[model samples]
Target: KVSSPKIQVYSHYPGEYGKENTLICYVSGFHPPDISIELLKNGEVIADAQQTDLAFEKGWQFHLTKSVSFKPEKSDEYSCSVRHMSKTKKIVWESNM
Candidate 1:
């Protein structure tokens, strides 16, 4: 088994309104039959997406993307998780606001 890569998020305009918010997650040695990304708030899942690329055979690399209007209403912790094939097997990474 391999360890999951560390997740990092960057905001275009932190603490400012009307600014676009983007999040990037990087994973390493993540060779699963299937993989998905989920965004969670207060331990609840809010948004999710499945991996669709068929480029790499194994291992992991830096995956980057942008999110739109990702403004939180209240001061809460935001988290992202990776779910592997087994359905019950998953890992999470989070940050406090």
Candidate 2:
């Protein structure tokens, strides 16, 4: 998480109507291969969050990124919720937004 998960937004043509802007969530350097992710806009889940299948990354041990994507709207704040595993089966998240 670079400050937070590195997020990127892309568009085929910058102000093109009918085209779309794609949001990509990039998370790296974490643990536990399993993680549940979702794209949230304005504190709500987007119905069509395009997520890629897990691609196991070879790092310190075992890790994977289940990144998700969405189409953002004006004044729409977006972020991906990562449900990372913990030994106690409980987790807490803290970050300076």
Candidate 3:
């Protein structure tokens, strides 16, 4: 089992209006880190992304999702979903913010 996560949005470059804004789903505070995540666009799944191992905090766990470049179909929508054996969590970022 795993605890809930804290999510963040980042831009590979300035002015996130471009296709470089990444939805990062970060989780920790548990053992047995078996987590998977995906990027959702326009209320649907578009691309299957990957996760990286951030140096675990002493006595804990941490994971980061791969940066997926999303091109909007006319200022479209983008978000992230984190899946674990117990449950799944989601986070949506403000566009061009």
Top TM-score hit: 3
Residue pairs in steric clash, candidate 2? none
Per-residue alpha-carbon lDDT of candidate 3 for residues 1-97, written as tens digits (9 for 90 to 100): 5466666654445434544444544555434566666677766876656567555665676656556655443476667776666677777755455
Q: Per-residue lDDT of 1-97 in model 1, one digit per residue for the tens?
A: 4444344444445534333454444433454434556655566665643333434533554343323236554455455565554443333333334
**Mind giving the per-residue lDDT tens digits that candidate 2 earns over 1-97?**
2122232333323423333555455444445455566556665666766666656555443333333333444445655556555321211111111
lDDT of each: 0.46, 0.44, 0.59
C-alpha root-mean-square deviation, candidate 1: 4.7
Instruction: Quote the lDDT for 27 in model 3.
Output: 50
- When summed lDDT is taken over every stretch of 10 residues in candidate 2, the lowest stretch is 88-97
After superposition, candidate 2 runs with Cα above 4 Å error: 1-19, 59-73, 86-97
The number of clashing residue pairs in each candidate reads 0, 0, 0
At residue 40, give the lDDT of candidate 1. Answer: 59
Worst 10 residues of 3 by lDDT: 11-20
In model 1, the runs with Cα more than 4 Å from the true position are: 1-6, 9-20, 48-68, 85-97
Name the TM-score of candidate 1: 0.49
Which prediction has the highest lDDT against the true structure? 3
What TM-score do all the candidates reach, one by one?
0.49, 0.53, 0.66
